Design a protein around this ligand. Structure first.
Ligand code: HEM
Length: 88
C-alpha cells in the first residue's frame, strides 16, 4: 500500500473529524483498534474500513464521489496501519 499517499489523503480529507485518530462528531467511535472492533460494521479489517469510506455511514460521509479507487485504497491502508500499530 502507498502509505505516503494515504497519510496526505487523510490529513486533507479526514482530519477535521478524526484528528489524532479520534472523532469530533461521535466521540467514542474513534479510529483506535479496540473502538473499531466494537463500532465498525464488519470488525477491524481492510474490507470493513474500505466499505465505510466508499459508502459512508450516518454522520460519516461517503467518499466514492470525491476520492478515486487508488486514493480510497491508500487511506484505508493508512487507517488500518495506524490502528494496528497504535500510531495515533
Ligand atoms: C476521510 C476520508 C475519512 C476517513 C478515512 C474516515 C474513516 C472512518 C472510520 C474507519 C470510521 C469507523 C470508526 C469506528 O469506531 O467505528 C469512521 C466513522 C465516522 N466518521 Fe469518518 N472518516 C473520514 C472522514 C470523516 C469526516 C470528514 C467526518 C466528519 C464530517 C467523519 C465523521 C465520522 C462519524 C460521525 C463516524 C461514526 C459513524 C457511525 O458509526 O455512525 N468521518 N470514519
Amino acid at each position: 500500500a502507498d502509505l505516503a499517499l494515504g497519510k496526505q489523503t487523510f490529513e486533507a480529507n479526514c482530519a477535521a473529524c478524526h484528528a489524532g485518530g479520534n472523532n469530533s462528531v461521535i466521540p467514542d467511535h474513534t479510529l483506535r483498534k479496540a473502538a473499531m472492533e466494537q463500532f465498525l460494521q464488519g470488525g477491524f479489517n481492510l474490507e470493513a474500513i474500505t466499505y465505510q469510506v466508499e459508502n459512508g455511514k450516518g454522520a460519516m460521509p461517503a467518499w466514492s464521489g470525491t476520492l478515486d479507487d487508488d486514493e480510497i485504497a491508500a487511506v484505508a491502508a493508512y487507517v488500518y496501519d495506524q490502528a494496528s500499530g497504535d500510531k495515533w
